Amino acid sequence: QEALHNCSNEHYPVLLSLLKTSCEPYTRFIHDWVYSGVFRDAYGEFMIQVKLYWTHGYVVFLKHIAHDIYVCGKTINLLKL
Amino acid sequence: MIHELLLALSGYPGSIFTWNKRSGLQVSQDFPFLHPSETSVLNRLCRLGTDYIRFTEFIEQYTGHVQQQQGQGGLHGIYLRAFCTGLDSVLQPYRQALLDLEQEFLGDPHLSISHVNYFLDQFQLLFPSVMVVVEQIKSQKIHGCQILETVYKHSCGGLPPVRSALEKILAVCHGVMYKQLSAWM
Amino acid sequence: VLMKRSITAPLAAHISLVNKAAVDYFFVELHLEAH
């Protein structure tokens, strides 16, 4: 929210670099459960946490795709069988 | 008396020039070795340093005190910070002139203060003109895009240094609105 | 500024393919349409 909060100033590049490096692990976390079906979590900084067979859980970002990742990871867990 | 005027005028005033917020800078003025001749030149020179301190104080006061966030446009807003941003870049040649004087004083310090007033005479006109432009914005608590008009009527000017100085700052204030326009449109 | 329209755009195109493979995998193997 600090990014949309100020962009028209000269402090925009420094904050842009800081957000660019602060989103580096989370994108890999997202990159895991889709492309390997490996739900990875370290300290609970990932937004969505963990017969009927699944006991995975759920909960700024687009909420249109936030539920979509929760269903996209479990689909990979189905194809492994 | 040569170096000390630079130390006062730079915005880091000494104890010879006791800064008040109701008189600005004032020399100590209680000597049997101070003459009326120095007095008038000093009093002319005092205005410029008082203006510079008020300018830098304004810029510091409204830039670097919040991230970007009262909702009142006279105290807060992106247009005002863009104004401060233009003002410091306008303030740059004053600093250049002060350093320029300093080098020649290190070469030979026996140069007169009249030459300093003679050099600094061009900013002596420019500073009071822009002073009222910032003072109106602070006084009337002007919100948003109306701030753009307030400089604008004063940037159709009839003196080249004043008009050219305000015009660039108005370009900065244009740019921030353009950036928001690049989203909403 | 940063938006999610340059990151989520190469992702949903893969999410759709994954879901299409799953709905295909249902019918061709467990024959739910037949069920």
Swiss-Prot record, chain A:
Signal peptide: none annotated. Coiled coil: none annotated. It comes from the Eukaryota. It is found in: Cytoplasm, Cytoskeleton, Microtubule organizing center, Centrosome. Component of the gamma-tubulin ring complex (gTuRC) consisting of TUBGCP2, TUBGCP3, TUBGCP4, TUBGCP5 and TUBGCP6 and gamma-tubulin TUBG1 or TUBG2. TUBGCP2, TUBGCP3, TUBGCP4, TUBGCP5 and TUBGCP6 assemble in a 5:5:2:1:1 stoichiometry; each is associated with a gamma-tubulin, thereby arranging 14 gamma-tubulins in a helical manner. Gamma-tubulin at the first position is blocked by TUBGCP3 at the last position, allowing 13 protafilaments to grow into a microtubule. Component of the gamma-tubulin ring complex (gTuRC) which mediates microtubule nucleation. The gTuRC regulates the minus-end nucleation of alpha-beta tubulin heterodimers that grow into microtubule protafilaments, a critical step in centrosome duplication and spindle formation. It is linked to Microcephaly and chorioretinopathy, autosomal recessive, 1: A syndrome characterized by microcephaly, cognitive impairment, underdeveloped retina and choroid, and epilepsy in some patients. The more anterior parts of the retina, near the periphery and pars plana, have a grayish hue and diminutive vasculature similar to retinopathy of prematurity. Visual impairment becomes evident during the first year of life. Belongs to the TUBGCP family. This is Gamma-tubulin complex component 6. It comes from Homo sapiens. The lineage of its organism: Eukaryota, Metazoa, Chordata, Craniata, Vertebrata. The chain holds residues 507 to 607 of 1819 of the full protein.
UniProtKB/Swiss-Prot annotation, chain B:
Transmembrane segments: none annotated. Disulfide bonds: none annotated. Ubiquitously expressed. It is found in: Cytoplasm, Cytoskeleton, Microtubule organizing center, Centrosome. It is linked to Microcephaly and chorioretinopathy, autosomal recessive, 3: A disorder characterized by congenital microcephaly and chorioretinal dysplasia associated with poor vision and nystagmus. Variable ocular anomalies include microphthalmia, retinal folding, retinal detachment, optic nerve hypoplasia, absence of retinal vessels, round areas of chorioretinal atrophy, and attenuated electroretinogram. Most patients have mild developmental delay and mild learning difficulties. Component of the gamma-tubulin ring complex (gTuRC) which mediates microtubule nucleation. The gTuRC regulates the minus-end nucleation of alpha-beta tubulin heterodimers that grow into microtubule protafilaments, a critical step in centrosome duplication and spindle formation. Belongs to the TUBGCP family. Component of the gamma-tubulin ring complex (gTuRC) consisting of TUBGCP2, TUBGCP3, TUBGCP4, TUBGCP5 and TUBGCP6 and gamma-tubulin TUBG1 or TUBG2. TUBGCP2, TUBGCP3, TUBGCP4, TUBGCP5 and TUBGCP6 assemble in a 5:5:2:1:1 stoichiometry; each is associated with a gamma-tubulin, thereby arranging 14 gamma-tubulins in a helical manner. Gamma-tubulin at the first position is blocked by TUBGCP3 at the last position, allowing 13 protafilaments to grow into a microtubule. This is Gamma-tubulin complex component 4. It comes from Homo sapiens (Human). The gene is TUBGCP4.
